């Protein structure tokens, strides 16, 4: 398995303009369009984004291509953060990737927010670093994906994506 193969089954594919779990406008693999609320902002951005007249749809191969700009976009971010830098060094293969999907989820600035758990994992207390993680939110919120992104920091394994 690898952060593609895992971020592929934590967002899914959808190649028409939909809304994601916060009702925004998204489309692809997880590529956040727009917060606004008008369809017609997010078809701009769309087209904006591709390059060409979309009409609210994309092909495969387009989403693939979003796909690898935005994981490459969030390893670039968190590199460049002061504050994940440091914790993503610190880290092993697995869990390094599950530091990638928070950050792909819920952007650069909002994982560095969580200034306790980054602590912990740095310090390599998985089994703190993973009770803290789940009081938030983000775990609230979308809770299965929450549950397989923490016990991959807590294994250190693939398990939790086995499965599925």
């Not at 303009?17 to 956040?32: F, P």
């Not at 369809?39 to 951005?45: H, I, P, R, T, V």
Request: glycine share 6%; with cysteine.
């Amino acid at each position: 398995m690898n952060i593609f193969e895992m971020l592929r089954i934590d967002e899914g594919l959808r190649l028409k303009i939909y809304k994601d779990t916060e009702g925004y406008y998204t489309i692809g693999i997880g590529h956040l369009l727009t917060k606004s609320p008008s369809l017609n902002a997010a078809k701009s951005e769309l087209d904006k984004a591709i390059g060409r007249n979309c009409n609210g749809v994309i092909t495969k191969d387009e989403a693939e291509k979003l796909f690898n700009q935005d994981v490459d976009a969030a390893v670039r971010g968190i590199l460049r953060n002061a504050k994940l830098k440091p914790v993503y060094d610190s880290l092993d293969a697995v869990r390094r990737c599950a530091l990638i999907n928070m950050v792909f989820q819920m952007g650069e600035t909002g994982v560095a927010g969580f200034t306790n758990s980054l602590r912990m994992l740095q310090q390599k207390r998985w089994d703190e670093a993973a009770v803290n993680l789940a009081k938030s939110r983000w775990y609230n919120q979308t809770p299965n994906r929450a549950k397989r992104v923490i016990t991959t920091f807590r294994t250190g394994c693939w398990d939790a994506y086995k499965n599925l």
